[PDB]
Design an enzyme around this catalytic site. Structure first.
Site, PDB file in Angstrom:
ATOM      1  N   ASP A  37      33.129  30.350  38.629  1.00 20.06           N
ATOM      2  CA  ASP A  37      33.620  31.147  39.741  1.00 20.06           C
ATOM      3  C   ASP A  37      32.852  32.444  40.008  1.00 20.06           C
ATOM      4  O   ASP A  37      33.098  33.464  39.350  1.00 20.06           O
ATOM      5  CB  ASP A  37      35.141  31.402  39.541  1.00 20.06           C
ATOM      6  CG  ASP A  37      35.828  32.201  40.651  1.00 20.06           C
ATOM      7  OD1 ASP A  37      35.188  32.424  41.725  1.00 20.06           O
ATOM      8  OD2 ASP A  37      37.001  32.572  40.467  1.00 20.06           O
ATOM      9  N   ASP A  91      31.627  32.851  47.172  1.00 19.98           N
ATOM     10  CA  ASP A  91      32.733  32.524  46.288  1.00 19.98           C
ATOM     11  C   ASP A  91      32.879  31.053  45.945  1.00 19.98           C
ATOM     12  O   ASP A  91      33.428  30.262  46.724  1.00 19.98           O
ATOM     13  CB  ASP A  91      34.036  33.131  46.872  1.00 19.98           C
ATOM     14  CG  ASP A  91      35.264  32.958  46.003  1.00 19.98           C
ATOM     15  OD1 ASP A  91      35.103  32.671  44.782  1.00 19.98           O
ATOM     16  OD2 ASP A  91      36.384  33.148  46.520  1.00 19.98           O
TER      17      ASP A  91
HETATM   18  N1  LIG Z   1      37.394  33.315  43.240  1.00 18.66           N
HETATM   19  C1  LIG Z   1      38.279  34.086  43.946  1.00 18.66           C
HETATM   20  N2  LIG Z   1      38.139  34.476  45.179  1.00 18.66           N
HETATM   21  C2  LIG Z   1      39.288  35.322  45.584  1.00 18.66           C
HETATM   22  C3  LIG Z   1      38.890  36.747  45.907  1.00 18.66           C
HETATM   23  C4  LIG Z   1      39.569  37.477  46.872  1.00 18.66           C
HETATM   24  C5  LIG Z   1      39.197  38.774  47.156  1.00 18.66           C
HETATM   25  C6  LIG Z   1      38.168  39.376  46.454  1.00 18.66           C
HETATM   26  C7  LIG Z   1      37.483  38.687  45.470  1.00 18.66           C
HETATM   27  C8  LIG Z   1      36.459  39.346  44.669  1.00 18.66           C
HETATM   28  C9  LIG Z   1      36.589  40.654  44.241  1.00 18.66           C
HETATM   29  N3  LIG Z   1      35.736  41.282  43.422  1.00 18.66           N
HETATM   30  C10 LIG Z   1      34.690  40.543  43.023  1.00 18.66           C
HETATM   31  N4  LIG Z   1      34.417  39.282  43.385  1.00 18.66           N
HETATM   32  C11 LIG Z   1      35.323  38.719  44.197  1.00 18.66           C
HETATM   33  C12 LIG Z   1      37.865  37.376  45.216  1.00 18.66           C
HETATM   34  C13 LIG Z   1      40.017  34.616  46.741  1.00 18.66           C
HETATM   35  C14 LIG Z   1      41.384  34.455  46.630  1.00 18.66           C
HETATM   36  C15 LIG Z   1      42.104  33.850  47.627  1.00 18.66           C
HETATM   37  N5  LIG Z   1      41.554  33.394  48.754  1.00 18.66           N
HETATM   38  C16 LIG Z   1      40.231  33.512  48.887  1.00 18.66           C
HETATM   39  C17 LIG Z   1      39.707  33.009  50.204  1.00 18.66           C
HETATM   40  F1  LIG Z   1      39.016  33.944  50.904  1.00 18.66           F
HETATM   41  F2  LIG Z   1      38.994  31.823  50.219  1.00 18.66           F
HETATM   42  C18 LIG Z   1      39.431  34.124  47.918  1.00 18.66           C
HETATM   43  C19 LIG Z   1      40.083  35.388  44.298  1.00 18.66           C
HETATM   44  C20 LIG Z   1      41.256  36.065  44.007  1.00 18.66           C
HETATM   45  C21 LIG Z   1      41.802  35.951  42.739  1.00 18.66           C
HETATM   46  C22 LIG Z   1      41.195  35.169  41.768  1.00 18.66           C
HETATM   47  C23 LIG Z   1      40.019  34.500  42.057  1.00 18.66           C
HETATM   48  F3  LIG Z   1      39.474  33.722  41.102  1.00 18.66           F
HETATM   49  C24 LIG Z   1      39.487  34.640  43.328  1.00 18.66           C
END
Ligand SMILES: NC1=N[C@@](c2cccc(-c3cncnc3)c2)(c2ccnc(C(F)F)c2)c2cccc(F)c21
Ligand code: NA
EC number: 3.4.23.46
Length: 371
Positions: free
Chosen positions: A218, A37
């Protein structure tokens, strides 16, 4: 092991569910699949049973675990919360190293874990500025660089599997030239979009509109997300190009599928989208061209399998442009942290009429495009 060759094909995924890498946490090592991520900065792992979790981090089994006596609460579409600590971390199909890193042990969550995604945690690759609870929690990549001789760079080849090359660029993953756009600020991987074309037609907006309030790269977001004004203009232009067929309004809103008899998708009716990114020199830019094979995301479903069904993977944002997985797919993307820049090149992973492209230079004799 540890060579870029042994890193090739170290990612797996489920379409729309992110790309993951195998990691180990604790001593003795506990194997987990971790979502890659670039849109967050916490290394956070499931650390308690959950209906969607195959396995989870068991801190009581790790002698190397150190409790930081600090809670972390992350509300965002859902939430996750847990406890901070540090432990030994390694990437079996990554660099040949073990590092001590911060780890957020997720003890409670809402709509965070996905049923059948095959991942148990998230590797936040962005900067300390956006880490939770605050910027004093050193992100994983920062620790990896501080503790080893790994160069301060990583690259992603997302294949709509894929590869995460830590510490370098693998030439077998792309063709042509690598074009660089500056990282505007080290928080998210923030970039500047200077021009948008659909079917070679300029959207003709002030370039600040494209970056309202930030534009980021992202890997943790599926779609290409656009600010309202940009999103509306894009949809109008795509509808005009594809006017030989009329789809439900729900399709354009990304809440309804469009299906065609297997093998008959009319790719030709859908236009190419070009995103011009700020170059490393004043008023010079390059463009990345995305085909409908990238922006029409196939939804795998045995029940609808007499057909090929797609979700429109371009959606409205109120938090700026998000160049998600559908954009990264078919580009080799270099996160050159050492030189504060992001490189794009056509990925080694389209049709007989068109191909995705990374090309330039383009001159705009221009105002500043950022907020
Ligand atoms: N880019 C991001 N990473 C987050 C995330 C959380 C859970 C699942 C995914 C995901 C689901 N399906 C496909 N790809 C990714 C992404 C995220 C949000 C908050 N906190 C974190 C933490 F773990 F660092 C991650 C996330 C949530 C919302 C918007 C975003 F841009 C993101
Ligand atoms: Na170093």
């Amino acid at each position: 092991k540890g060579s870029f060759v042994e890193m090739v094909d170290n990612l797996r995924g489920k379409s729309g569910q992110g790309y993951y890498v195998e990691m180990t946490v604790g001593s003795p090592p506990q194997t987990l699949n971790i979502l890659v991520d670039t849109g967050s900065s916490n290394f956070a792992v499931g650390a308690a049973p959950h209906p969607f979790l195959h396995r989870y981090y068991q801190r009581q089994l790790s002698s190397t675990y150190r409790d930081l006596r600090k809670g972390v609460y992350v509300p965002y579409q859902g939430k996750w919360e847990g406890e901070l600590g540090t432990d030994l971390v390694s990437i079996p199909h990554g660099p040949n190293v073990t590092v001590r890193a911060n780890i957020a042990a997720i003890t409670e969550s809402d709509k965070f874990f996905i049923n059948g995604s095959n991942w148990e945690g998230i590797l936040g690759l962005a900067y300390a500025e956006i880490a939770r609870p605050d910027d004093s929690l050193e992100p994983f990549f920062d620790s990896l660089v501080k503790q080893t001789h790994v160069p301060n760079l990583f690259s992603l080849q997302l294949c709509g599997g894929g590869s995460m090359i830590i510490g370098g660029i693998d030439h077998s993953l792309y063709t042509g030239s690598l074009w660089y756009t500056p990282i505007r600020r080290e928080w998210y991987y923030e970039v500047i979009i200077v021009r948008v074309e659909i079917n070679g037609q300029d959207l003709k907006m002030d370039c600040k509109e494209y970056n309202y309030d930030k534009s980021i790269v992202d890997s943790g977001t599926t779609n290409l997300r656009l600010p309202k004004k940009v999103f509306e203009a894009a949809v109008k232009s795509i509808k005009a190009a594809s006017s030989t067929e009329k789809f439900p309004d729900g399709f354009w809103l990304g809440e309804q599928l469009v299906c065609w008899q297997a093998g008959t998708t009319p790719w030709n009716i859908f236009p190419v989208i070009s995103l011009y990114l700020m170059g490393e020199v004043t008023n010079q830019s390059f463009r990345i061209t995305i085909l409908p094979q990238q922006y029409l995301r196939p939804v795998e479903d045995v029940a609808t399998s007499q057909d090929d069904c797609y979700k429109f993977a371009i959606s409205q944002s109120s938090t700026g442009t998000v160049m998600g997985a559908v954009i990264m797919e078919g580009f080799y993307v270099v996160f050159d942290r050492a030189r504060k820049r992001i490189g794009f090149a056509v990925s080694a992973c389209h049709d007989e009429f068109r191909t995705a492209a990374v090309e330039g230079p383009f001159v705009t004799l221009m105002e500043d495009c950022g907020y």
